Amino acid sequence: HHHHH
Amino acid sequence: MLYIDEFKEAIDKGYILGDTVAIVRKNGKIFDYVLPHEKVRDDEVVTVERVEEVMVELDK
Amino acid sequence: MLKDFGKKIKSLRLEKGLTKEAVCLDESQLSTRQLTRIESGQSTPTLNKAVYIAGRLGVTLGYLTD
């Protein structure tokens, strides 16, 4: 979802 | 040009956080957004706008 | 489909000795920021941007699709 996750 | 899907993706991926976002307009039309780490050139006109109001305007 | 679009357009741009700014020309259709986001995969390419970029790099869009 959120970047780097 | 800014697609509603592009804006929504930037929110979904956590690049556009919070209630407001920096917007570049050209010829009266929303042209782009600007993230905190990005640069703008001197001739680009930047306004701080409400995310939900940008969404309304793009959805039209 | 355009999932690998960013990597391919970056390769082709660098091949041709072009900066992102040169691809974007007067930035009336594409900002340097938007091209950067596409190349890194930050932003999914939309149709108008993908076709504009393909034309700027001298190829049909089919050269750049998955």
PDB file of C-alpha atoms in Angstrom:
ATOM      1  CA  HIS A   1       0.000   0.000   0.000  1.00  0.00           C
ATOM      2  CA  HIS A   2       2.274   2.807   1.257  1.00  0.00           C
ATOM      3  CA  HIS A   3       5.656   3.082  -0.428  1.00  0.00           C
ATOM      4  CA  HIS A   4       8.431   0.847   0.972  1.00  0.00           C
ATOM      5  CA  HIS A   5       5.792  -1.255   2.770  1.00  0.00           C
TER       6      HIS A   5
ATOM      7  CA  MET B   1      -2.462  17.455 -16.812  1.00  0.00           C
ATOM      8  CA  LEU B   2      -3.354  15.568 -13.636  1.00  0.00           C
ATOM      9  CA  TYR B   3      -5.599  12.507 -13.854  1.00  0.00           C
ATOM     10  CA  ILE B   4      -7.836  11.729 -10.888  1.00  0.00           C
ATOM     11  CA  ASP B   5      -6.321   8.239 -10.908  1.00  0.00           C
ATOM     12  CA  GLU B   6      -2.794   9.686 -10.675  1.00  0.00           C
ATOM     13  CA  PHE B   7      -3.748  11.854  -7.692  1.00  0.00           C
ATOM     14  CA  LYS B   8      -5.575   8.992  -5.993  1.00  0.00           C
ATOM     15  CA  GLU B   9      -2.557   6.724  -6.519  1.00  0.00           C
ATOM     16  CA  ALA B  10      -0.225   9.284  -4.941  1.00  0.00           C
ATOM     17  CA  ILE B  11      -2.530   9.319  -1.920  1.00  0.00           C
ATOM     18  CA  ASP B  12      -2.848   5.528  -1.810  1.00  0.00           C
ATOM     19  CA  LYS B  13       0.939   5.053  -1.943  1.00  0.00           C
ATOM     20  CA  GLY B  14       1.423   7.551   0.885  1.00  0.00           C
ATOM     21  CA  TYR B  15       3.176  10.280  -1.093  1.00  0.00           C
ATOM     22  CA  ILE B  16       0.385  12.846  -0.556  1.00  0.00           C
ATOM     23  CA  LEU B  17      -0.196  12.895   3.199  1.00  0.00           C
ATOM     24  CA  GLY B  18      -2.453  15.138   5.228  1.00  0.00           C
ATOM     25  CA  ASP B  19      -5.240  17.526   4.327  1.00  0.00           C
ATOM     26  CA  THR B  20      -3.410  19.848   1.911  1.00  0.00           C
ATOM     27  CA  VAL B  21      -1.162  19.496  -1.122  1.00  0.00           C
ATOM     28  CA  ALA B  22       0.872  21.789  -3.356  1.00  0.00           C
ATOM     29  CA  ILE B  23      -0.640  22.211  -6.837  1.00  0.00           C
ATOM     30  CA  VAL B  24       0.674  23.691 -10.086  1.00  0.00           C
ATOM     31  CA  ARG B  25      -1.903  25.287 -12.381  1.00  0.00           C
ATOM     32  CA  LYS B  26      -1.371  26.246 -16.030  1.00  0.00           C
ATOM     33  CA  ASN B  27      -3.993  28.108 -18.093  1.00  0.00           C
ATOM     34  CA  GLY B  28      -6.359  27.999 -15.125  1.00  0.00           C
ATOM     35  CA  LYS B  29      -6.330  24.186 -15.151  1.00  0.00           C
ATOM     36  CA  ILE B  30      -4.754  21.950 -12.540  1.00  0.00           C
ATOM     37  CA  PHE B  31      -1.536  20.766 -14.208  1.00  0.00           C
ATOM     38  CA  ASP B  32       0.441  18.848 -11.572  1.00  0.00           C
ATOM     39  CA  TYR B  33       1.030  18.274  -7.878  1.00  0.00           C
ATOM     40  CA  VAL B  34       4.314  18.889  -6.035  1.00  0.00           C
ATOM     41  CA  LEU B  35       5.572  16.601  -3.269  1.00  0.00           C
ATOM     42  CA  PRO B  36       7.765  18.045  -0.494  1.00  0.00           C
ATOM     43  CA  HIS B  37      10.976  16.563  -1.939  1.00  0.00           C
ATOM     44  CA  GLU B  38      10.306  17.724  -5.525  1.00  0.00           C
ATOM     45  CA  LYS B  39      11.411  20.953  -7.194  1.00  0.00           C
ATOM     46  CA  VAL B  40       9.517  23.539  -9.227  1.00  0.00           C
ATOM     47  CA  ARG B  41      10.890  26.043 -11.712  1.00  0.00           C
ATOM     48  CA  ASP B  42      10.584  29.794 -11.192  1.00  0.00           C
ATOM     49  CA  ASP B  43       7.760  30.209 -13.739  1.00  0.00           C
ATOM     50  CA  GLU B  44       5.540  27.492 -12.205  1.00  0.00           C
ATOM     51  CA  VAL B  45       2.674  28.861 -10.095  1.00  0.00           C
ATOM     52  CA  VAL B  46       2.213  26.831  -6.898  1.00  0.00           C
ATOM     53  CA  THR B  47      -0.787  27.001  -4.562  1.00  0.00           C
ATOM     54  CA  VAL B  48      -1.574  25.073  -1.387  1.00  0.00           C
ATOM     55  CA  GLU B  49      -4.978  23.428  -1.834  1.00  0.00           C
ATOM     56  CA  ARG B  50      -7.265  21.044   0.035  1.00  0.00           C
ATOM     57  CA  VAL B  51      -6.905  17.416  -1.071  1.00  0.00           C
ATOM     58  CA  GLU B  52     -10.672  16.835  -1.093  1.00  0.00           C
ATOM     59  CA  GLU B  53     -11.318  19.993  -3.125  1.00  0.00           C
ATOM     60  CA  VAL B  54      -8.675  18.979  -5.672  1.00  0.00           C
ATOM     61  CA  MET B  55     -10.419  15.606  -5.911  1.00  0.00           C
ATOM     62  CA  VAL B  56     -13.766  17.295  -6.536  1.00  0.00           C
ATOM     63  CA  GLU B  57     -12.244  19.485  -9.249  1.00  0.00           C
ATOM     64  CA  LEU B  58     -10.467  16.581 -10.966  1.00  0.00           C
ATOM     65  CA  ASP B  59     -13.530  14.312 -10.872  1.00  0.00           C
ATOM     66  CA  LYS B  60     -15.462  16.799 -13.026  1.00  0.00           C
TER      67      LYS B  60
ATOM     68  CA  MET C   1      -0.199  -3.076 -20.436  1.00  0.00           C
ATOM     69  CA  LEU C   2       2.353  -0.608 -19.033  1.00  0.00           C
ATOM     70  CA  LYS C   3       3.826  -2.164 -15.879  1.00  0.00           C
ATOM     71  CA  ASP C   4       7.430  -2.122 -17.178  1.00  0.00           C
ATOM     72  CA  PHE C   5       6.955   1.181 -19.026  1.00  0.00           C
ATOM     73  CA  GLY C   6       9.148   3.270 -16.722  1.00  0.00           C
ATOM     74  CA  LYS C   7      12.272   1.119 -17.041  1.00  0.00           C
ATOM     75  CA  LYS C   8      11.945   0.851 -20.827  1.00  0.00           C
ATOM     76  CA  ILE C   9      11.426   4.565 -21.415  1.00  0.00           C
ATOM     77  CA  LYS C  10      14.367   5.394 -19.150  1.00  0.00           C
ATOM     78  CA  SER C  11      16.583   2.975 -21.078  1.00  0.00           C
ATOM     79  CA  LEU C  12      15.499   4.393 -24.448  1.00  0.00           C
ATOM     80  CA  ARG C  13      15.887   7.998 -23.264  1.00  0.00           C
ATOM     81  CA  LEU C  14      19.414   7.382 -21.973  1.00  0.00           C
ATOM     82  CA  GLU C  15      20.234   5.514 -25.199  1.00  0.00           C
ATOM     83  CA  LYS C  16      19.314   8.609 -27.239  1.00  0.00           C
ATOM     84  CA  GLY C  17      21.367  10.933 -25.024  1.00  0.00           C
ATOM     85  CA  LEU C  18      18.299  12.830 -23.811  1.00  0.00           C
ATOM     86  CA  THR C  19      17.604  14.386 -20.427  1.00  0.00           C
ATOM     87  CA  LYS C  20      14.169  14.132 -18.849  1.00  0.00           C
ATOM     88  CA  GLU C  21      13.809  17.857 -19.521  1.00  0.00           C
ATOM     89  CA  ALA C  22      14.490  17.306 -23.226  1.00  0.00           C
ATOM     90  CA  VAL C  23      11.759  14.646 -23.363  1.00  0.00           C
ATOM     91  CA  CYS C  24       9.312  17.041 -21.694  1.00  0.00           C
ATOM     92  CA  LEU C  25      10.044  19.953 -24.148  1.00  0.00           C
ATOM     93  CA  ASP C  26       7.983  23.028 -23.079  1.00  0.00           C
ATOM     94  CA  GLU C  27       6.342  20.956 -20.313  1.00  0.00           C
ATOM     95  CA  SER C  28       2.903  21.751 -21.711  1.00  0.00           C
ATOM     96  CA  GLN C  29       1.984  18.034 -21.800  1.00  0.00           C
ATOM     97  CA  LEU C  30       4.372  16.530 -19.228  1.00  0.00           C
ATOM     98  CA  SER C  31       6.291  17.961 -16.296  1.00  0.00           C
ATOM     99  CA  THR C  32       9.777  16.738 -15.454  1.00  0.00           C
ATOM    100  CA  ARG C  33       8.321  15.617 -12.110  1.00  0.00           C
ATOM    101  CA  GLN C  34       5.693  13.451 -13.828  1.00  0.00           C
ATOM    102  CA  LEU C  35       8.275  11.808 -16.091  1.00  0.00           C
ATOM    103  CA  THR C  36      10.493  11.147 -13.059  1.00  0.00           C
ATOM    104  CA  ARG C  37       7.602   9.503 -11.211  1.00  0.00           C
ATOM    105  CA  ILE C  38       6.855   7.282 -14.198  1.00  0.00           C
ATOM    106  CA  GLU C  39      10.490   6.221 -14.713  1.00  0.00           C
ATOM    107  CA  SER C  40      10.891   5.205 -11.060  1.00  0.00           C
ATOM    108  CA  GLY C  41       7.523   3.435 -10.895  1.00  0.00           C
ATOM    109  CA  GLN C  42       6.203   5.981  -8.385  1.00  0.00           C
ATOM    110  CA  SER C  43       3.334   6.836 -10.750  1.00  0.00           C
ATOM    111  CA  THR C  44       1.559   4.460 -13.091  1.00  0.00           C
ATOM    112  CA  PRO C  45       1.667   5.869 -16.637  1.00  0.00           C
ATOM    113  CA  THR C  46      -1.608   7.170 -18.008  1.00  0.00           C
ATOM    114  CA  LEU C  47      -2.499   6.857 -21.682  1.00  0.00           C
ATOM    115  CA  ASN C  48      -1.914  10.460 -22.741  1.00  0.00           C
ATOM    116  CA  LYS C  49       1.478  10.610 -21.018  1.00  0.00           C
ATOM    117  CA  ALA C  50       2.560   7.217 -22.374  1.00  0.00           C
ATOM    118  CA  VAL C  51       1.667   8.138 -25.956  1.00  0.00           C
ATOM    119  CA  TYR C  52       3.326  11.554 -25.630  1.00  0.00           C
ATOM    120  CA  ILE C  53       6.510   9.930 -24.302  1.00  0.00           C
ATOM    121  CA  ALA C  54       6.562   7.236 -26.983  1.00  0.00           C
ATOM    122  CA  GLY C  55       6.312   9.915 -29.665  1.00  0.00           C
ATOM    123  CA  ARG C  56       9.054  11.992 -28.050  1.00  0.00           C
ATOM    124  CA  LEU C  57      11.311   8.915 -28.048  1.00  0.00           C
ATOM    125  CA  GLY C  58      10.565   8.189 -31.705  1.00  0.00           C
ATOM    126  CA  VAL C  59       8.698   4.876 -31.416  1.00  0.00           C
ATOM    127  CA  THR C  60       5.184   3.513 -31.555  1.00  0.00           C
ATOM    128  CA  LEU C  61       3.700   2.829 -28.150  1.00  0.00           C
ATOM    129  CA  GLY C  62       3.856  -0.890 -28.964  1.00  0.00           C
ATOM    130  CA  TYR C  63       7.643  -0.758 -28.684  1.00  0.00           C
ATOM    131  CA  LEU C  64       7.222   0.117 -25.001  1.00  0.00           C
ATOM    132  CA  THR C  65       4.351  -2.117 -23.862  1.00  0.00           C
ATOM    133  CA  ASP C  66       4.742  -5.268 -21.773  1.00  0.00           C
TER     134      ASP C  66
END
